Structure formats: structure tokens, C-alpha cells
Amino acid sequence: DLPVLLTDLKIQYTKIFINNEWHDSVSGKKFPVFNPATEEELCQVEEGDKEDVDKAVKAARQAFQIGSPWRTMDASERGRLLYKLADLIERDRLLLATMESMNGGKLYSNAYLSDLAGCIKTLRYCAGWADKIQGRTIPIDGNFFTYTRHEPIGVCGQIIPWNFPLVMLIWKIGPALSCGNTVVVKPAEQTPLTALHVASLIKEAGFPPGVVNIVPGYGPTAGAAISSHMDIDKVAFTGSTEVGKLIKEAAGKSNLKRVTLELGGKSPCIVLADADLDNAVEFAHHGVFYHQGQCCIAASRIFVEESIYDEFVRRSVERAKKYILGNPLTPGVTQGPQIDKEQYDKILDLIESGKKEGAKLECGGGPWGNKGYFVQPTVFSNVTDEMRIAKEEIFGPVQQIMKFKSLDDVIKRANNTFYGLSAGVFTKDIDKAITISSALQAGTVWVNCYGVVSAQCPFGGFKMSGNGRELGEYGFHEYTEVKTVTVKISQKNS
Amino acid sequence: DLPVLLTDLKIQYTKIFINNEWHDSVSGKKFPVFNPATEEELCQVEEGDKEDVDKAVKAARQAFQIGSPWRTMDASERGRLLYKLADLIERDRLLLATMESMNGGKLYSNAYLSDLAGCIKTLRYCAGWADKIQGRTIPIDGNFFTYTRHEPIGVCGQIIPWNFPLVMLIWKIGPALSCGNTVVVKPAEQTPLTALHVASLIKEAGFPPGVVNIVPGYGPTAGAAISSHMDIDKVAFTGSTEVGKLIKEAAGKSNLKRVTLELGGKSPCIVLADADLDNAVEFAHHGVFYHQGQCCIAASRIFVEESIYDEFVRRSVERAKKYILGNPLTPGVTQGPQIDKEQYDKILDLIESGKKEGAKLECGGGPWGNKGYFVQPTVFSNVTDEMRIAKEEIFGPVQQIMKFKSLDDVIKRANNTFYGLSAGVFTKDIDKAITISSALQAGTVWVNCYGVVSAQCPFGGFKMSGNGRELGEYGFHEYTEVKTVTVKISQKNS
Amino acid sequence: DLPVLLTDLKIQYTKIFINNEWHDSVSGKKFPVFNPATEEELCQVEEGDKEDVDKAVKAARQAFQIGSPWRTMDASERGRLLYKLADLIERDRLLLATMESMNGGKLYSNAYLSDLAGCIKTLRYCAGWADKIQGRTIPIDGNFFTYTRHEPIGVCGQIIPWNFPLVMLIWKIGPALSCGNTVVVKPAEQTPLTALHVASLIKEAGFPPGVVNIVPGYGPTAGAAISSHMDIDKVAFTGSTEVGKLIKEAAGKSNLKRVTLELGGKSPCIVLADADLDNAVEFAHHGVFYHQGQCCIAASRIFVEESIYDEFVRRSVERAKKYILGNPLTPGVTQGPQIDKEQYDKILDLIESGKKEGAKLECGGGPWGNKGYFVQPTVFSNVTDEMRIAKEEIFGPVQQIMKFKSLDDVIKRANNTFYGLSAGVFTKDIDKAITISSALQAGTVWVNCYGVVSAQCPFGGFKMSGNGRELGEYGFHEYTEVKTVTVKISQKNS
Amino acid sequence: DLPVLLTDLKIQYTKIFINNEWHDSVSGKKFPVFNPATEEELCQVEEGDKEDVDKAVKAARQAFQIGSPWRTMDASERGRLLYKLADLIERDRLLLATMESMNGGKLYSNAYLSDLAGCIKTLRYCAGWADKIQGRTIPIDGNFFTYTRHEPIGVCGQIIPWNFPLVMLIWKIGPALSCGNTVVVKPAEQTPLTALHVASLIKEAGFPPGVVNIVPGYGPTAGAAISSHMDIDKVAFTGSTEVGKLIKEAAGKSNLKRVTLELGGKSPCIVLADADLDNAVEFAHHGVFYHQGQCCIAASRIFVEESIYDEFVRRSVERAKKYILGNPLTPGVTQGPQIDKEQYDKILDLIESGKKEGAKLECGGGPWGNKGYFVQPTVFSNVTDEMRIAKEEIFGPVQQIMKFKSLDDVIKRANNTFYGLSAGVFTKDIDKAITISSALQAGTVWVNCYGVVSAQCPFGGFKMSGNGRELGEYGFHEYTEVKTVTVKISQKNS
């Protein structure tokens, strides 16, 4: 069931959201926001800078003060507000999916059926945790009563990427709010719009002012302001590994603010000779090509055992030749554009290395169309490990297919990277499935599938693919700060 | 019961410990180690540098490899090795306490009765966790079986301070080993000796080679090598907040290694008019003066309600005038020296600010003796908030006593610091105890006591007093890395 | 805000609810349901017997089969259905509160503001747990992968009392459904009506057929059928301790079905001389008199320290003399009737023992009105331990006030009972609050309050006041059955 | 490495152990204890009856009193005592294994290498939990501070079977003591001796008097006294399902004491056509034949897919023909006797039903020797579901092998029993392994193995094979009683 918006979308919310009201920028500057499919300007949005981040942090800090409505309300009521926010996003699902598609260059079918469904489900999941965050009573040595409080940390700075704007917004704000924090969100310069609509719904839902503040703008200005701020308690960032290093560095320099990072990858799949071949081809395909390759988990190195390698490449290539490029809003279209020029160039530049360094181009390998940042879906076979396309995150519709014959060696090759976000193992053998997934240095390991993400399980990177986890029970720990309270008593009893 | 060593202590272990063997430094340089009470050289120890840290990390990495003895042994057996290590430390308790006293400038009674007891107890606590570290099975959306592995992270770099050398060594290695990590430990340049004895006991206990590697040396060389190493997965550091910022920065610059920091404080006590006055005086006293003030939790701002302030100061001062300074090995001695010159100067320099900025000197305020880094126990009353002695961590035997009359205001004053390691609340009122301890921005809040530390509860700082927690159930999380494994199945059932 | 129903209530649902359809009884018998305030017949309801319970269990068993919709749906979707049920109960809050008031003899203000609010909140709480029920991955000795599944148990028989019909229905079905069980509910013979309305809302919400089946009827017939059934996996019962013993016995005789029991009490309060006197009087008052004394937690022995005893009795008695008896639907009325004749007689019979055994009657002590099972609010002072009114659960508006002078002795006296559901401690002293609450053999201990129940914390009895806990995280364990799955592997790694 | 005792074993401890001293029976009666291999009397032991159980419960109750040494000692110290007990059992491993072999009819190699190793390991596991039992702090609605205490329950009655006397003793006392309970243990009438030696080691280790009391004697006298006692808080029983029903019934009749039951089974294995055939044969073999078939988990129905059935039967039969019967103390002996006459008769009687009801006798099927309760190892093929040997627990060395061709049907057949202790699944297919183990109504499901038991994972039965779980984290819950403490406060903050 794929319903659509009957009237044309109008952009309404374009301002900095602080204390549940709409603010002009302190400078009074604004910045344009584009459709990546047409290269046309959609609207202008107020440009937040350091001065605006400062207003946002003061609002967050006041909303966090002992005795405030957000600190004193029942945990169950924090949950209620979150479930209300989810109902409102559900009510505005058509509007949000359309805006997400138009601004993000994201296929509308996927925006509506996956992105918005995952947004609503993740919020509902997080709402349920709010009054289930618990500390401990602890049988300490000596005559003492010891308990712990898993408090909110405080003001959390949250920097959101452009590839899944709504999903990433909710992955940040859901847990942070469930645990009782206040937030200053900086959506991506490319994709501020859907977040600003969500902010209007945060107001409608009745969150106390200052609990969520959204400051659109650029990364080197507003993002740097967040990462170096002396009164932000924690920064959460999803994006490139390069920028992640700057975030962590700045946190260290400033006020030792807590850090979680969800970064890029060069995620490997290992396809054994006994694998269901079609299932492995289909999931490895979608594993690399989903959302024009603009997923941190992109299955960008597919190692296939020699005896099934040729047949894997053949079947893969024919699956890649089935796409229909164009406007993601038009039904039947199955591949939209890349987000912007910067990304578009890096993709094409990396495609050229594949050719020059001697990979076998099976299909694609150039641009498409008169407008929009479109790249033909590209498959390279006979890829080797020291090639640029096997080392660097492409973030584009570019599949690398490698051969192996030794399992020990292909595991070393899979692990031979500074990345470690995710990986895939395709086999019918129980022992292989368990032992290989244990040996892979990856945060999520999928077995006979790929790209299966859900609110109930933790998600994040090994190595330079991240610090910490988001979602699941485990991810909620990083939005709490633990206080131990130890009380002298005359005599304890067990 | 205070037994002693019958023969004089001989120093035996003075070398870099890698792969369970004793190594000369790569350069071949050595550095002297001193008794702080006599200023005499005790011995020379091999000086580890970047080149030696590199040998230690390669050993740790090999011991961590899939299929190694440490990775494949039963969790219960990791526990057994840890409980064996504790039995060996218990066997060598006299030797270790004497060495700890002589090298650290630490009162022997405290070394034997508290430091060594806490070392043994913490190891035994950690041993019990080893086969109780568990992941989850998760009711993910869709037809999938999802489980998590709480794996060890890998090679953990661990930098240990000089104030509690043995206790801090065990606080690091106990949890890291219980969870299955391998470690490269850099004990403090001032106090390498007790760690090198523990390393001999790690060998005796039968830990596989490379699981624990100890590299003595200086902070700016060996410590920097650890913090910037591209194949260390995690750094744990206890020390100054200043150096903590350098550690976190370097982690960001290098390989985004995971970070936990246990840093300094300017920890406040709030003494209400209804408090048991003598109990508050005794705990606030020991809270600031323990181990010559060289505790990160030093209760270095004591706020007392006006109506009991004069009587609190009087009783405090007379308690401070009861000390006997000298060699910590001599029975009856109740105050040893500061660790070294650098610390000694900072202490005296800060004592001079108290005088010049107009605090009331009640006793002390100068040095003591012909040898040793001794400082007279010092009490200042009528201390105000903008004084250096109320803002800066002294790390010396220097008590600050402040007056207050408003509870709201004294809580703001208590929280008005970038620090937040711990705090104390003294009152008989149930509501005051709970509400004040909730409102304090401190990692541990003691009620009608101070400095009660135990293996069963988590310990660490709010704000710039730390990132993360050590010990308790909660502290064990930061020595694991969580992997989600999601397996496609034909049909799930609840 | 106390809104009311504008039209008169009409009874609609009067039949046995199996497989989401309305069934006549197998015999074809029906039984009358009365208003306790007027003694008038409200309607007739279909009388379930053993033959009907058998139809209900076959439906529950089929809905529980591997591959069924309830077993295969996402846990998150079980949660969604529960949150939907809560929205529907909220929509029908006026109707439900009126029906609850009219059938249960329950003050409408309390029905609407407390009972229905707690019903809605408990369901929403339980909904949030559904996809957060998790097993473990376990570092077993040897080369094995071990995980656990916290499965639903299966068909759960649930017997609901008459004192809080809606709240008790939801306390049973919320957790049992959240965990994935199917249920056969037997509401009290006195109060079947509100449950049958909830069943219509279970249908409307879209729960698969057979997941909830409701069989009204009598205890000795339908309740016994449930407790002895050979294909019911678990029985949950709230009611008298006497019947609880029969339930547990029958479970043993039949198929060793799992048992949880929430039974009666003779719950004590200990009021120390330093207590806030008015707060202690107010909470102890409401602690015994709430819902005409028909609470399992009734604070039916109030021990007050000698020096404040007279003043406690005086203030208590004047609070008890403020009630307005009558129809619970009429505004201004502050005390409704007892549920039925059986209860009414036991209450009056026990009031007579108080008089005959020599308690001091301060007020009340007889019946009220021309119709309805009304008992005057009664206060006895100078009650002693071997009196019937100090040993037996009255379940009526009858307060017992005792004196004590020794704390050790009053704790023994408080604990000197086969009961142990709850207790109260009133004092300003931190140490007394902690030590007394630790020493009381009671499932819930309130400090400076009484009767504070919430979905987030576990609730149940020590001793013959119950087996197991309901609600909180802990209560959810008893609606799961744990399966260990141990898989042979070639080699494990930590 | 199989070492032995150099001198002959002498029996020393033969008396009732209460308050850490040795008691004659109240009557003054004694009962004989036999070697099952020779039918010779080993010694006489003091016969505990109801009057002796009463002395034991009064001792347990006093040791449990608030303020006692056991209630007030550090949790860590309960752990220490347990680890000390394990060291003492390790010291006496030869003595204990010999006594266990001689009294229990248990192969000495298995007694020494498995039973004693598992005893020591389980105790060490349990010791580690003692100071890691924790309650919660809970974000309750309203202005309250709520925490929970996971208290010990109190006096726990523990009834131990004869098949694994030491292992079962430690499975009971380890968790119960770790959690802070006191115990009254009734070892099996057949095998009291090893428990009485352990009691001497409990004294030596320094457990406070009354914490462990051991009352040897018969089941219908001392066991019934335990199950019906009005001051025992909990009964734990391992044995027949028949007696389990009597225990649960008596608990209900008496004081609603908490119950856990570990009962018998008729545990199925499902061997798929793709299974490693030799591995399935070897584990299914040991799964049924271990300890002369006297395991509650006996794999007593082996369903094998038709196409590999004949080859499975052939290989199974030849494995069964390899045994050497005799005295379990003699090296080379690989099968000892059944425990006693009662068991011996039931086994032979059930073997006769197999023959008369038309099973194919492949080997065995009669007694062996001139003395001792020896039964030839017996294999039946072509067993059908309504045969006595496929329905009733034999508890003897008697294997049943069945054929199947439909997976759906064989799962129904596997689940078609009132039992549900364990099961086995043998296959190479990932999906089959997960889906079949989910669908089996069994507490432990082994995949490509059988009889893998370890301290780290919970163990117990579905259906009439048990109530509750022992060991693992989960099993520790049933030795705690949860208390909720809810404290009124002026204002809460998250």
C-alpha cells in the first residue's frame, strides 16, 4: 500500500527552534536548501552559528535544572510524550515522507514504507524504556546502604547526517529524551527540513520548552560550536570517520564531554560455497546499493568463494542492470540521486581509481542525466585489497566483488581495515555461521541476510566505525550518568 | 593486628614485563626511583619508551588473537586465574605493603590494613564476574534470531597514578582481565615497583604470555605512546584532569580508541545544622586528610551551616593538631610525606594563596623536617569561593571550611565547579538526605560518611572529574564491546 | 476534574468470551449480579462451569500453538495491541468507572480518578515491556554456544477478586500478554461486568482469537476447574489466603502448573515518637479505610509509641467521624457499601469480638442504612495482640490502634503473623527508616506514606500473603519460561 | 589423570548435623546404608525424623534472625566462605569421589573427573554471585524514592536425590547460601554419607552455626516433615515427578512455602537425515546410558529419520555392546549397578513390557552378576509411542530408538508427554536447529550434543519435569524474596 499526498507540499518551518518558539539567526543570515534530483533551490533556512548554539544550550540547561518540569515529571510521562510524538509523526507520515524524499533525494516508496515506519517504531520503542531505566541496590562491604541512580547526563549535543534525516533524528532524540536529557540537535546542512517539522510536533505534543532545541546550519560552524561548548555534557555524532576524529578531539580539548560516534565503514560480506546463492546475491546487492549506496553499513567488499564466484558476479551484474533512475517522487523509479556535489565528485573520483588500478568494470562507471547528482549503478569484479575502491568508503552505488579460496585468509582480509561497522556471512553450516561471526571485528554481523536494523537491538561500530552503541537496552546506558549513594547505617542485614 | 616484615625488603623486579619475561629497554636507558620520606634513591628501573610500548602492544595483540589460549579458555578459568592472583598477593601482603609504603610515601598501617585488603578484595570481586558477563537474545522485528556477544574490546592501555599504586593497578587489570582483554600497563614514574612485583605473580599464577604487559617509564613518553597508539583499542587513565584532556584529545587524533578517565576533584561536603556534629567532623576530617590529601575524592570544600560553623571549625582544628609526622614505616607515625617535589611545590604555592587572598589560617601552613616532602597539616576557615584554595585541587593536607545559611545557595556553590567526582551530605533528616544527594552533580554522594569505597559499587566522575565508571556491575560494561548477531530464519516464535 | 456519564448506563456484555465471540454457557444456566448499595439485581450473566473452562483452554491452547499469529507476531506488535487496548479503555473511561462503581460498590470519584487511571497506566507500562523481554548469551564451560529464550509459559489461568475488578484484570492480563501468553480469566462472581466490557475492547483492538478468554461464574466451580486443569500451564490468583492454599494444593495434585498468589494481610504500621504526627495519622487512616477496608494491604494494626499514642488516637477518631455514607454514584458521598452479605457478616462478627474481648470502641461498631451492605467506620484503641481483630483480616472499615514503648518488641509483634503483604514506618530518622524497613517481613514497606502502588515496582507478599510478584521488571519473570539452548561448536572465543 | 586413595576409606561422619555439631536422633534410631555393587552394609547413620527436622528448623531460624552473624556479614564474606568450602572439597576430592563411588554405585572415574569437578566448579561459580545480588531503584509515579531489596527468603528445606549426591547437594546449598539463606538438607536415604562429610567441611570453613543443617533419614518421614513444616519458607526438591506432586500439595496445605522442583523426564532426541551420524550416535548413546541411565535428562526417546534409521540402530547397538560391568571402583569397569532394589525391579519390569508390547530387543534385556543391582545395557528398536518404555521414565540403562519421516509429526510426538526436562536436535542446517529447538517444549535443548551441563546456565523443566530453574543468573532469583521500599519525598528529580 503506497498512498501519496494529494496537494503539493508547502514548506512551513524554516527557523531555529529554541524554547518551543521559532527564532531568526543572531546574525540574521540564511542558507539555501536544494532538491538533489533537480538541483533547484527548495527554500532558505535560518543559519545557526556559535551564537545560536549558545542560546540553545542555555535553554537546554534551564530545562535540565533540578525542580524543572522535565526533571520532576513522572518517567512514565516522559514516555507518554514520546508515544504522543510518534502518533503525530504517524498522522503526518505522507507530508514527512514527501519532504524527506524531496529534500534528501530519497525514493518515496522507501521513505514512506521504511524510513517513516522505522521512525515511528523507534520512537514507540524508546517511549517504553522511559520508566524502566533503573539503578541498583548494592550489598557493599561494611555497615552501609548503597544505591545507584541512573540519572540523565544533561544537555546532549546531537549532530545528524543527511542520509537518513528523520531516522537519525529519532535515533538521537528518542533515547536521550526517554532517559530524561535535554538536547540541542544540529541537522545536516543538506537536510534540515524534516527535523524542523518534527520540532513543530514536539511543541504540539507538549514537551516542556527547552527540552528539544534544533539549530540548523553548517558543520564547521554550528557543529564545531556544539563539540567545543563548555556547558554541553555529551555529544552524539553520526557521520564520516574523519569528522568523528575532530569531534572526539574537540571534546577532549574543551570540557571532556561524553562522546558517542556512529561512523562510516567498509563492511565486508563472506559468501561460502555452500550458501543459498540467490539469497546471498540479493542481500549483498541490496546491502551495497540501498539508498544510492549512502549507508554507513554499505556491504562494500563482497568476498565469494572461488567455485561460486563467477556465477555470483553474473547474477549480481544482472540484478544491478535492472534499475530505473530518476525523480524519487515518480512511481516506478528505483534509484534517486546522490545528495550533493561534494559526494558526487568523491564517488566519480573513486570510480576512476577502480578503472585505472585495474578492476573489471561489469556495468555502470559514469554519471546519468542532465540534472541531479546521479551516478550509474556500478559493479567491479576482480577487485583486490590495495585498490582504493576496496579501502575507501565510496558512499555511492558502487559494488566491489572479490574472490577467495581460504577461510582463514578471507577473515584476516575482512578484518584488515580500520573500519568495523558491520559484516555479512552467508552459509548453511551451523559451525561456520557461529565461528565466523565471532571472529569478525564488526558491530553487527548478519547471517544469511544484510541490513536488518531494528529498535530492539544495539547498533554501532568496532574500531574507527564508532564509539558506543545506539538503541536496544545497551544503547540506553550512554544517555545515563551513574551516581552511587552510600549511606552510613547502624547495622545492615542481607 | 599489624604484623611486619622480619627481614629488610630487597628490590628484585626492575624490568619491563612483556610476554611473561623481563626485558631491558630498547634504548637501554634506566630511571631512578626514590623514597619520598628520605629523598634517597631506592633503585633504578628500566625506562620504557614508545619503542617498548610497541613491543608490549604486539604481545597484547597476539595474546588477543582468535584461537589463542586467552580467547578460548573458559570464562570460569579467567576467573580462577584472577582468584589465584589474589591468593598470591595475599601471600606476599607484607612484602607488598612494605614496598608500597617505602616507594609511595604511604603509612604502613594503611598500606597493610586498607590498600592491600582492598587490592585482594577487588581482585576476588572481579574474578567472580568473569563467567557472569552475558549478552542478550532479543525479540527483533521480522523473522530473525538476534543475539548479542559482550566481547572483550581487545588491547587496553592502562595508565596508573602514584597515589594508590597497587589499588589502581588492580582496579584496571581486574575488570579488564575478567572480561577477556589483554593489557599494557604503565605504572607511575614515581611508583613502578609494586606493579613489577605483581607482574612476577601474574607469571606465577599462570596467565598466558602477553595477557598482562607492564611498561614502566614517564608519562610524556610512554603514556603518550599508549594514548596515540594505532593498535590500542582502549585507554584507561587515572590522574589529573589536565592530562585527562590530553589523553582524550590524542585518542581522537589517532584511532578513536575508547576512553575512560578517572580524574581529580574539588569535592564538597554539606553539613546541615541537624547533623551529628562529631561524626561530620571526623569523616570530613579524614575525607580531606587521608593519605596526605593525595586522594582524587579529597573533601576539599566543607560547607557548614552558620549556627554550627564555629564549633565545627574548633573541633576540626583540634583533630588536625593531633598528627605525628615522619617515616611511614615507623609505628605511631600518623602522617607521611607528599610524593615528590612537583606536588610539594604546588601544595606550598597554593597554601600561600590562601594566606595572601585572606583565608584564616587555623593551623599548619608550612613545611616540616630536614628531609622528605613533608607539609604541615593545614586548616583554613572563612574560605570564600573565588579563592584559589576553593577552586584548585591542592592534592595536599589542606582543609578548607566554609559557612552557609541557605540550602539552595550552598547546593549551587557545591555544584559550581567543572569537577564532580564525589560529595558528602551530613544530616539526620530523611528528605534532606535524599533531595540533596539527588541534586549534587557528583559521581559518589556519601550520606553521614565519606570515603567509603568498595568493589561492589561503581565509581567515577560527573563533568571533568571523569568519563565512565570503574567497578561494580556497571564498570564492567566499559571493558566489553557489544556485537549484534542477526540470523535470518524461516519463522520465529516468541 | 470529575466528569460523569450523561445518559444512564446500559449493560450490554453478559456472555462467556471465547475465541473473540460471545458464548452461552454449556449448561445454559445464568447467575444474577447485584448492586451492593441497593441490593438490587443489575442483570444476569452466563454461568461458566468446568465444561466452559474446557472450551476456553482449548481456545487458549490453539492460540498458543507454534506458528500461530500470536506466537509469530513481532513482540513490538504485542506491545502495540496492549497500548491500543489502553487507548480504548481511556475512550470508555466514564462507562467503565460507572459500571465499576455500580457493580463493585466503589466510590465513583475513586473509580474514575484512581482505578481507571491505574488501569490505563498499568497497561501502557506493560505494553512497553513486550519487546524488551530478553534472554542471555552465556559463557558456558567447554566449546559451546549457549543462549536462553525467555519464552511465554503458555495458557495462564487467572482468577480475579471483586475489590478492584478492572485494576486486577489488567494486572493479570497486561504482563501475561506482554510476555506472549494466552489467558483464561475468571472474574469474581460478584463483579463480572467490567471484565466483559474489556473483552469487547480486546476484540476491537484486534487481539487474535483465543489470546484472551473470559469465563464468568463461581469460584468453587469455574475457579476449581482452572486450578485443577491438566492443560493450563500456570494459575495466577488474587484473593483470600484460605483459597490460595486450595489453589496451590490443586496445582500440585493435577499437573504441577506454575503458581503465583497475591493474598490477604494483616499489615502493620509502626509510628515512632519523632514522626510527623498528622502525616502518620492521615496515611494510616487511608491505609486502613480505603475502599471500605477492602484492600489486601489494609493497615489493620497501627502500633504507636506511647508518648504520642493518645494524641494519635484522638486525631484518628476525628478523621474517622468525617465520613458520609451512601450511594457511591452520588457526589459528596465518601463511603460506599461492603461487597456482599458473606463479607458483611464476617465484618460485623469480628466487630463483636473486639467489643467482647475488651477493645475500646472509639466510634462506629454497627451497621448503617435500610439497604446496602453498609458498616459504620469503626476505630478500636487499646487493641492487644491475641484479640481476633488484631489477628484476623477483617476486610472492612475497622481500624485497630495499639501502643508500644520498645522498638525491638514492636518489630517482633509486627512480624508475629503468618501474613506479610505490606507495612508502614513513620519516622524522621534516617537510620530508623532503613533498619526498620529491612527488618519487617513484608513485601512492600512504605516510609512516611502508605498505599502507594505503581506499575513500575514489584508488588506481592512475604509468607502466607503470597508467592511471587506482580508488575515491575521482576513481576514479568513469572510470565516467562526459560529455555537453555546449548550448541556444540568447533571452538569458542570470548 | 586418574589418581586414587592409597589407604582404604574409613567412614567417620554418621550423625545429624545441627548448629555445627553432631546429634544423635531424638528417637535414638539408626538406619543402614549399603553398597549397591556388593549389597553389603557400609555403615549405620542416625535416622532423622519430624522431631529432628524441628531441631534443624529452629537452628536455621535462629541463624536467619536480623542481627545474626549470617545476616550481618558482608555479602563478599558469604562468597569467601563458599570459595573456602570449594577449596576444602578439592583437598578431599579423592576421599569424596571414593565415598561417592562406593555408596552411590557410581563409576569412580566419573565420580572423580566429572562429579567432583562439577561440585567444585559450581561452588566457585556460586561464591562469585554472593556480592552481585542486587535490587533496583525505580522511577515510580509521584514524589517518592522507591528501591527494592533482593533479600534471602529464609529457612530453605532442600531434599536431595541419590543419583548425583554431591552435585545435587552443591546445586542446592551453593545458590541458597550465596543469597544469604539458611538451609535444612535431607540427603537421600540411599546416599547420606558424602553430604555428612561436606557438613564437617562446612564447620571447618567457618560457616556460622545453623546456616547449614543436614538431617539424614527417609523421604516419607523427614522429607514430609520438611514439606509440611510451618516455619520453613521454601522447599527445593529434586526427584521423581510423583513425589514432586506430593511436595507441592503439602506446601499448599501447610504455610504456602515457596517451591522449586527438578523432576524426571522422558527426554527426546530428533536426529535429522543430514546430521553428523557418528556424533549423533555417540551423544544419544551417552545421553541415555550415562550413570546407568539414572539421569533425569536421560535421552529416552531417540527419533531418527527413516533413511538413516537402520544405520543409526546398527551403530548404536555396537556401541552398547562395548561395556564392562562390575565394581565401579575397579579400573577398566565401564558400568556400575543400579542404586537399589526398588529401582532395579521397576527397570526389569519395564524391560518386560518392551518385550511383551512388541519392541525389537537388539541387545541386553536381563540382569547381570551374582551380587549387585546390575542390569545389562539394553537397546530397543522399532519402539512405538503408546508402549510403556516410550511413556514411562525407566531410570535404567535402556535405550529406545524410533523412526520418523515427517518433521511436523515428530515434533508433536516429542512434545506429546507431560514431561519436558530436556531434548536434543542433531542436524547441520541452521534453520532446522533454531526452529526445532524453539518448538520443543523442553527446558534445555542441546544442538549436536547432549548432557552438557554447566554452572553458568539455568537448568530445569517445562511442564511436569519441574517448577523454576537452578543455577545461572536466573536460578539465583528463586533464592531471593523481593521487598519494595517506597519513601515519601518532597520532590523527586530524574
Ligand SMILES: C[C@@H](Sc1nc2c(cnn2C)c(=O)n1-c1ccc(CCO)cc1)c1ccccc1
Ligand atoms: C530504516 C531502518 S534503518 C536502515 N535500514 C536499511 C539500511 C540499509 N538497508 N536498509 C533496509 C540502513 O543503512 N539503515 C540505517 C542503518 C544505520 C543507521 C545509522 C548509522 O549507520 C541509519 C540507517 C530502520 C528499521 C527499523 C527501525 C528504525 C530504522
Ligand SMILES: C[C@@H](Sc1nc2c(cnn2C)c(=O)n1-c1ccc(CCO)cc1)c1ccccc1
Ligand atoms: C583502599 C580503598 S580505595 C580508597 N580509600 C580511601 C580513600 C580516602 N579514604 N579512604 C579510606 C580513597 O581515595 N580511595 C580511593 C578512591 C578512588 C580511587 C581512584 C580514583 O579516584 C583510588 C583510591 C578500597 C576499598 C575497598 C576496595 C578497594 C579499595
Ligand SMILES: [Cl-]
Ligand atoms: Cl549501577
Ligand SMILES: [Cl-]
Ligand atoms: Cl546487549
Ligand SMILES: [Cl-]
Ligand atoms: Cl537466562
Ligand SMILES: [Cl-]
Ligand atoms: Cl526488583
Ligand SMILES: [Yb+3]
Ligand atoms: Yb552538471
Ligand SMILES: [Yb+3]
Ligand atoms: Yb629540601
Ligand SMILES: [Yb+3]
Ligand atoms: Yb438487611
Ligand SMILES: [Yb+3]
Ligand atoms: Yb539377587
